[PDB]
Amino acid sequence: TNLKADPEELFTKLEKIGKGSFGEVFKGIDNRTQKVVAIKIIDLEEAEDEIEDIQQEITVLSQCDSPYVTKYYGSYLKDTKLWIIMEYLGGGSALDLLEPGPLDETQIATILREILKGLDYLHSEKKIHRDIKAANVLLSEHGEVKLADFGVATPFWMAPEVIKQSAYDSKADIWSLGITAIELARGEPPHSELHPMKVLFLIPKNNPPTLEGNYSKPLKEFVEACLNKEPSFRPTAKELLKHKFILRNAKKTSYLTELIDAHH
Ligand SMILES: CNc1ncc2cc(-c3ccc(-c4nc(C)ccc4OC)cc3Cl)c(=O)n(C[C@H]3OC[C@H](N)CO3)c2n1
């Protein structure tokens, strides 16, 4: 965390991307490199309770060096405002691109596959994302898919063992991915119309959700493989990259450029 170099001199904000975790995020320019950056600015006095959360997410992402995790560039503290500088991803989130209209399975598989490479890099480094969902998967202008907005230590994407506050491992991410697959194919997670507290007991109590509708069987089997109530019966991210649904449908990441151009 740099406190001597003035972030307002190092960076040129250009537009507000939107609100984010605990602060506003800007599309910006590193003035030394003139590369585009994402800049979250947090007033630490206005969010004193969540500061360990902020610290934890900075710590976990500063330890990631993978094409599939949003790159971390540093932090700056000017008076009470913390600037968190990250890679900028100009294609938006996976959830943004579900809004132009329902995704076909080629796009679902290609995004799923890229997410899985992120999960497998993380899980091999003994890390957990803890909040895998469409809104936390960001895409570049050229179709690359990267994980962002890590959780630290809404329930719709949570594994049943996570809800029941048991010690959870990488298999929680696998469950969340199975929910994300349903989201990318349907637009929203299971139980999305229900009050969160109801969903909090539905997930431990009920059978795993399955992908309903007119989809190919491998997509349904990909989902149900992820959505196993027992975490130790969920495949690794490495296993799932060989799932028949991924092998038959996933394309090159550049194929998504068309879908990204639809959103703009
Ligand atoms: C659209 N393009 C795009 N490119 C890049 C980003 C990067 C972030 C981002 C994320 C997290 C943290 C962070 N935060 C804390 C609290 C601690 C440490 C942290 O980083 C180490 C910092 C940033 Cl700079 C960002 O908010 N967004 C927008 C964001 O997308 C996901 C969506 N769910 C909400 O809106 C982005 N957008």
Instruction: Decide whether any atom of ligand 1 lies within 6 Å of the 57 Cβ.
Output: yes
The Cβ-side half-sphere exposure at 243, using a 13 Å CA radius, reads: 28
CA 234 to chain centre: 19
Instruction: Decide whether any atom of ligand 1 lies within 6 Å of the 37 Cβ.
Output: no
Judge if 79 and 104 occupy the same domain.
no
CA 49 to chain centre: 23
Q: How was this structure obtained?
A: X-ray
Instruction: Decide whether any atom of ligand 1 lies within 6 Å of the 135 Cβ.
Output: yes
CA 148 / ligand 1 centre spacing (Å): 6
Query: Could you say which of 39, 60, 88 is where a domain stops?
Result: 88
Q: Where are the alpha helices (DSSP H) in 125-169?
A: 160-163
Contact 80, 214 (CB under 8 A): no
Q: Which atom of ligand 1 is nearest to the CA of 38?
A: 24
Strand order of the β-sheet with 81-87 is 11-19, 24-30, 36-43, 81-87, 72-78
Q: Tokens standing for 263? A: 């959103």
Q: Tell me which DSSP letter residue 79 carries.
A: T
Q: Where are the alpha helices (DSSP H) in the chain?
A: 7-10, 51-62, 94-97, 105-124, 160-163, 170-186, 196-205, 217-226, 237-240, 244-249, 257-263
Judge if 104 and 67 occupy the same domain.
no
Instruction: Decide whether any atom of ligand 1 lies within 6 Å of the 138 Cβ.
Output: yes
CA 70 / ligand 1 centre spacing (Å): 9
User: Shortest CA distance to 89 belongs to which of 29, 134, 36, 24?
Assistant: 36
Judge if 19 and 125 occupy the same domain.
no
What is the amino acid identity at position 93?
S
**Phi, psi dihedrals of residue 259, rounded to the nearest 5°:** -65, -35
Judge if 123 and 220 occupy the same domain.
yes
In the chain, DSSP finds a helix count (H) and a strand count (E) of 11, 8
Indicate left, alpha or beta for 172 from its phi (over 0: left) and psi (-120 to 50: alpha).
Answer: alpha
Instruction: Indicate the number of domains in the chain.
Output: 2
Strand order of the β-sheet with 137-139 is 92-93, 137-139, 145-147
Instruction: Decide whether any atom of ligand 1 lies within 6 Å of the 64 Cβ.
Output: no
193-224 in b/e form (b: 16+ CB < 10 A) is eeeeeebbebbeeeebbebeeebeebbbebbe
User: Shortest CA distance to 144 belongs to which of 118, 122, 123?
Assistant: 118
Angle at 92 between CA 16 and CA 114, to 5 degrees: 145
Tell me which residue has its CA closest to atom 11 in ligand 1.
149
**Phi, psi dihedrals of residue 222, rounded to the nearest 5°:** -60, -50
Q: Tell me which DSSP letter residue 92 carries.
A: E
What is the amino acid identity at position 205?
K
**Phi, psi dihedrals of residue 223, rounded to the nearest 5°:** -60, -50
Judge if 79 and 188 occupy the same domain.
no
Judge if 202 and 148 occupy the same domain.
yes
**Phi, psi dihedrals of residue 42, rounded to the nearest 5°:** -120, 125
Query: Could you say which of 47, 64, 88 is where a domain stops?
Result: 88
Q: What is the span of the domain harbouring residue 199?
A: 89-264
Instruction: Report the DSSP pairing between strands 24-30 and 72-78.
Output: unpaired
Judge if 31 and 80 occupy the same domain.
yes
Tell me which residue has its CA closest to atom 2 in ligand 1.
89
Q: Tokens standing for 33? A: 């490199």
How far apart (Å, rounded) are the C-alpha atoms in residues 194 and 25? 30
Judge if 112 and 216 occupy the same domain.
yes
Q: Tokens standing for 169? A: 């491992």
Strand partners, 83: 41, 76
How far apart (Å, rounded) are the C-alpha atoms in residues 224 and 207? 11
Query: Could you say which of 88, 114, 143 is where a domain stops?
Result: 88
Residues with a catalytic annotation lie at 131
Write the burial class of residue 172 (CB in 10 Å: 0-12 exposed, 13-18 middle, 19+ buried). Answer: buried
**SS3 for 197?**
helix
Q: Which atom of ligand 1 is nearest to the CA of 61?
A: 21
Give a three-class secondary structure readout of 30-55: ECCCCCEEEEEEEECHHHCCCHHHHH
Annotated resolution, angstroms: 2.4
CA 11 / ligand 1 centre spacing (Å): 16
Judge if 126 and 76 occupy the same domain.
no
How far apart (Å, rounded) are the C-alpha atoms in residues 120 and 68? 10
CA 222 / ligand 1 centre spacing (Å): 28
